[PDB]
Amino acid sequence: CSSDSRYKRQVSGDEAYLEAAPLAELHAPAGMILPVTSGDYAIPVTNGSGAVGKALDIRPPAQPLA
Amino acid sequence: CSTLERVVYRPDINQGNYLTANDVSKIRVGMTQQQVAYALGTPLMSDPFGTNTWFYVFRQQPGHEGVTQQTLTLTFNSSGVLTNIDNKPAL
Amino acid sequence: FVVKDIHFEGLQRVAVGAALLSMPVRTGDTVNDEDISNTIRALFATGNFEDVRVLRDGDTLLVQVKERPTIASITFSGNKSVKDDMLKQNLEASGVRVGESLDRTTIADIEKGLEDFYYSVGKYSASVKAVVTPLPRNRVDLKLVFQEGVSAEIQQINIVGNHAFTTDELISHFQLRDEVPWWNVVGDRKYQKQKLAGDLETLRSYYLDRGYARFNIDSTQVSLTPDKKGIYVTVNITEGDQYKLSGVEVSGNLAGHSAEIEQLTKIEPGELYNGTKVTKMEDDIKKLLGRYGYAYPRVQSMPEINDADKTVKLRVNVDAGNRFYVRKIRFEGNDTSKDAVLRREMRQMEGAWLGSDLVDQGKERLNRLGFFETVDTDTQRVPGSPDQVDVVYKVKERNTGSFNFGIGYGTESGVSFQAGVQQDNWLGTGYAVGINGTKNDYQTYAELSVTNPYFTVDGVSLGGRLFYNDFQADDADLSDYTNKSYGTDVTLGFPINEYNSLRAGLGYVHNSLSNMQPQVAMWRYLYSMGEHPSTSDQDNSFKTDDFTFNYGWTYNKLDRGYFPTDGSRVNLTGKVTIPGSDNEYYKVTLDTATYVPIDDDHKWVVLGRTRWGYGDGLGGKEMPFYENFYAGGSSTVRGFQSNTIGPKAVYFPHQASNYDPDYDYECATQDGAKDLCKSDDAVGGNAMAVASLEFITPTPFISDKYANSVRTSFFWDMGTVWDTNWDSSQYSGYPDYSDPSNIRMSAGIALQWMSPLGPLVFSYAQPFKKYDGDKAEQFQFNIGKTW
Amino acid sequence: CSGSKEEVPDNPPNEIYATAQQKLQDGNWRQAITQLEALDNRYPFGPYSQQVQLDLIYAYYKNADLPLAQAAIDRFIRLNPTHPNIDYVMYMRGLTNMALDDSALQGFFGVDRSDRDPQHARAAFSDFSKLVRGYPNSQYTTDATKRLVFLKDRLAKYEYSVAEYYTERGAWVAVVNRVEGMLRDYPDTQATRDALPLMENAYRQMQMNAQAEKVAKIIAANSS
Amino acid sequence: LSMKDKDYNPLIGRTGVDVGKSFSGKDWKVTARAGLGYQFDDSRMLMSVGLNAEIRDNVRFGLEFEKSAFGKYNVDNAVNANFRYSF
Amino acid sequence: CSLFNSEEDVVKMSPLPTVENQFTPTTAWSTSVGSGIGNFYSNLHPALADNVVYAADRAGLVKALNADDGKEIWSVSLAEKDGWFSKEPALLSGGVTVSGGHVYIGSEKAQVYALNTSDGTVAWQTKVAGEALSRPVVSDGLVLIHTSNGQLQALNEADGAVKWTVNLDMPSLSLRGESAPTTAFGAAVVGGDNGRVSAVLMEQGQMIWQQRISQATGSTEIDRLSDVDTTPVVVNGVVFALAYNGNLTALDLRSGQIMWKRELGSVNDFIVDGNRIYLVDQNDRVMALTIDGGVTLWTQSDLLHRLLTSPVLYNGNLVVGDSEGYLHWINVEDGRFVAQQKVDSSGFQTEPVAADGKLLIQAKDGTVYSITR
């Protein structure tokens, strides 16, 4: 081909796919709660600045020399 | 509204709760939430912002704009006590 | 012994970390030989290849295991027309490929599963081998060589213990047949244990229905000829005594539902006993349980059967299945047609009452709808409470529909080009995908169609489409009628009463029509619309701009398809035209299929195909003459020419028709016909009424399955169609048809048989069209065009 | 499965794998996987096959070789009780999930897709949870720290679509439970807030207005 | 002197084997389409007769031989080839 | 033809090379009732009573002939008597045990009845239950018959007169394999499928011993070929036959315990001529090892998938015709043809006879062609 439909470095979707809209907190008012941490929940805490998107690469995880 | 002549809406409307006088009978104050759970199978609706107080209903008439509303709101607190029974079975 | 050496050997490609995990007791643990053997068979639990050599000389744990061709780097070859893809996919089911070190018992179970496959099929002349010649250095070379025989080519099906019921009778009640005489050529032979079971079931159930309630299921088997095929089917049974269904008794765990059910349970006592009665009588009541809503009940129809008294009392006692539960409908796929489109295509919903009935309705609903090839309705279990059951269903998509190129017969026309692109399941998102571009030389049609029958409401259908064809075929000059016909229409269906729908079609058509013939009908219309056609040339032209509506409604009381048994196809259709239309006129068309066999044996069967069409022009702007049904041909009257009955093609004379095509067009052509030529076969008149009688009965020279697939039709059915709007001044020497007597005489017999792959309708009718309006032919032949 | 004809004469794993690295930097992942598998067939031995399989994985995804990718996955994790690359694999394996992505074509308008397969989403979720917990150190570590929450929000959008179907179908009764299910999932995803007015109106239809107003003022103060 | 000979009754539940599978496959199918009424008036024929082959899943191609006769226009031999790819 | 000519599975077949007509087989008796049968599988031996060549058809037709050019004495199409529709299709299963003035027959319809030999018309009638597989065994008036499904009946030559029913063992799936129920020293002894042999009482069917021997389909699903047919040969009250797959013990009537073995060849037909026996196996070659240890001095493997009938070592000539209409004489030892008639395409299912040395054959067509060579 010579027009489109390729994938070599552009991360599928986009960087908006990398992140579109962050979370936001709500606050269940007095005498009223909500058990939410029920399921897939490992607290995501990164200090960064781990490569992301075009910065992120998945090159073969080889050894120094072979 | 009008008589039986306007835009017709008669497919099958579908809502299911085969509620009977068993429900009326098996219940007193301080009911055992788990035993009444099995007596009722599925606990449909609890207060997310409060105690259980399970909320059931029968809103069903197939087709025509008519429908039921036969609710089963039943107090369920801590210590497994039903202090109150709640039903507006009327439209 | 003190385990001091983590000592793993052979170390070909092993996860030695996983190996250290494989030993429960780790090194430096002074343990007994009990723990030693524990660790040993724990390493055996690796189950990939374990060539154990456990040595205890000092404190080193000399546990050596040697690698081998045990890598399963296999190959594959040497096979017959057996389904190779099934072979490979089941190897994948076992995962046997490169890696998965090897296992003599695993390759053995592969080979033997294939062998027992042969067995169950009976193809089963096993020449079976999984040749494992290992490529050097642990590698493998495999050859799957399997020369087999053919399946059970049905030999004798000898029936044992039969009496009072001829063998061939219940045979016909069964599936298995092994006959290809001069009689038929469609007989084939095969095997299935399940065929055997089901045939037994049909047999003894039938007997119950004969009141032979008691039955003796004897060990019926089949001897198999060695050293070749051969299948001698010992039908070893015993019918058991005849009885009458004397009573029906209920004592089942319920609450008042007893009386709620007896009305069904209630039957006339002392009936000749019937097992199908038992069936229906438990089916309806399970359905009523559903109409109340539970899990599914125990149903014991204990038959109190007494001999010499023929008694079948029915202690039919039923304890309802467990109570109402909720459920988790989850369907995977989720392509261009997102899940919701199916969520609505299934008549069932979480939150409301559950039931295998509703989910079943969803099953068949998706089935006959289809966007796929499977309806994998799989219910599962949520722990804690016996409810919110996991009903997670799968479909195997039937996507990427018709890519079509119809190329047909130039050399009279141009080579007919047709591009058919119907990629529903692709933009079958909720829509229709219809792309029809065809043209031979002069018959240039285009269909662009898209339909969400559910537009914002499942009921709300949306079919938008352009249908444009131009007929450009001509043979003369100043007489060359040409039709370009654009039509843009949107349709909106509305059943909310099931099998009861009205459909609103709102459409415009532009229709440029040139060089119209001297036909007195079209000329009547020209003068109606005020046009004064050229009384010399077939030359006039008009552009037909008609915006219009049509209401098409149908009721459907049907009982079965492929063979129609009870049919109620009730089809009204009325086209109405607005002043925006160039003419003001209204077509009414009535279509009635009314089919009932009074005989449940289907030998006294009354059927009616009845049809009517009437045009209502507002005068001067009437029913554009072509706006007419087709009377004749084979619509329902056959051996004729359609839209030729009634009116006769009278062409007002045009000897000025500008190069008569050398009698490729006549009747008021240049070399054509003089003062108005009363040629035959004009469009059927304003009013058409036709009625059709049908009946069937099997002949005593066939099998029952043929009757299940064949349809003998008897008919002397005389329609009549006439132009209500008629003049006799011009039709003075010519006939006059505003005439409710346009009768035929078609003493007709026909036959429509459908092979499992195609239907065929062939007829002989001795015709006497009272009013002729047609050609008389005796050979009304065609094969059913399954749409 | 087993293909990629070895039309090349068998040669030492080192030089053929050097050709593999040549195609690696060349991008002809088809023939690259071809020669890598050709090696491991001609060499079901050797720790050289470790890197051979790593490059197999990389050229799989750079070539969109999905079932081959899963084969690499399970075979290696059988060979991998642990490895210097597992979190890579972990991200890769979560990557594997999104590998079921492509369905259509858009250049200026766009079509929706966030109402589809949840299982691989949850799988990648687990993948990257295990990554960040076992590997709170990688480019993949941080990219997954954010990837997890992104795909959880995408799940929120999915569940919105699901709920709203029954709602518009009048089948609110199930969504009544479904909204508290989303709560047991998330209140904090914007999609949750987006849906809350719908469940409030449902409440009102079914006369739980007494809590419809609650959730309404919750989306007022709590949310925007 | 001790006594621990049997003094017990254990109970458990398991499952030995489960293996089960079934095969299936087709080879082709054909759909022929034909129609002919005689004339049977001057005598000749007039028909539109063809076919279509239904291969396992994907290949579908149809023939039609048609003909109109006894008219001032006459379709002599309308051989019509088509294909369908609903793979 | 090359289209329905290259689409089927095949294994192999010989040409039967080197036809040797050292003798000159002349069918000095040449007669045919036609049907007979054409393809099926059962024992349907016609009978004879002092040259009376009883003829028949697979329709309850009870015909006759005598040692002639073939000349009938009577023909009585006694298919049924008052069945469903007046002589229904009455196929046959079980040869004709003409004893006394009682022609003896039985049909898969479980119909059994004596016939006056002078007319083949009923001498007595006792219709039975179970598919009448075997032929009547009018053994000292103890007319013992087993029907295919593993149930046996004891009758009397008087009018049937059921004596004791033996609903004996059967495989999981009924299949081929029939046994010799002969009785010696007053012992109802019989072979059996399932690698099993039974010795019971010829007054009650009461077992004295039952021996299970070797294997077949079922957990070792031997697929499709000539295993061992379970009809033995017994001498001195000692049973001799292969086990069920070619393992030839000896089993004494009183004991039935395993004697000397010959684990060789899943042969089906076999006649003993003074402790000499012969092998044909699964492609119809001959390596005719005798029970005298390993005496294969009778081997003629010129037949590959050439189905055959029971051998006849008469006039010292090793003689038997195949099941393809061809006729074969053999050296007294191995084994080239002292004669051979590659003649018919008949096919054969029941047992012909060489009585008086006359080749009393029952061919599917050319039924009774007895030959002199």
Author numbering:
A (entry chain C): 25 to 90
B (entry chain E): 20 to 110
C (entry chain A): 24 to 810
D (entry chain D): 20 to 243
E (entry chain G): 1192 to 1232, 1255 to 1300
F (entry chain B): 20 to 392
Provide the authors' original text about this structure.
In Gram-negative bacteria, the biogenesis of β-barrel outer membrane proteins is mediated by the β-barrel assembly machinery (BAM). The composition of BAM varies by species with only BamA, an OMP itself, being fully conserved across all Gram-negative bacteria.
To investigate the mechanism BAM uses for OMP biogenesis further, we used in vitro assays to fold the MBP-EspP substrate into BAM-inserted nanodiscs for structural analysis. CryoEM studies were then performed where we observed a mix of particles with and without MBP-EspP in our 3D sorting, with one 3D class having noticeably larger nanodisc density indicating the presence of the MBP-EspP substrate. The final refined maps had a resolution of 7 Å, revealing not only larger nanodisc density, but the presence of a triangular shaped membrane domain, rather than the oval shape we have observed previously. The BAM structure was then refined against this density map which showed a widening of the barrel domain of BamA. Guided by the refined BAM structure and the available density remaining, we found we could accommodate at most four strands from EspP. The C-terminal region of the barrel domain of BamA, which includes the conserved loop 6 (L6) and its interaction with the opposite wall, appears to swing out as a rigid body to accommodate the extra density within the barrel. We also observed additional density in this reconstruction extending down from the modeled four EspP strands to underneath the barrel domain, indicating that the pathway by which the MBP-EspP substrate associates with BAM during biogenesis is from under the barrel domain of BamA. While a large globular-like density was observed which loosely resembled a partial MBP domain, we did not model MBP, rather only an elongated poly-alanine polypeptide extending from strand β9 of EspP. Given that this density was not observed in any of our other cryoEM structures, we postulate that this density reveals the pathway for substrate entry to BAM during folding. In our low resolution structure, we also observe density trailing down from the four integrated EspP strands to the underside of BAM where additional density is observed, indicating that substrate OMPs are likely threaded up through the periplasmic side of BAM to the lateral seam of BamA during biogenesis.
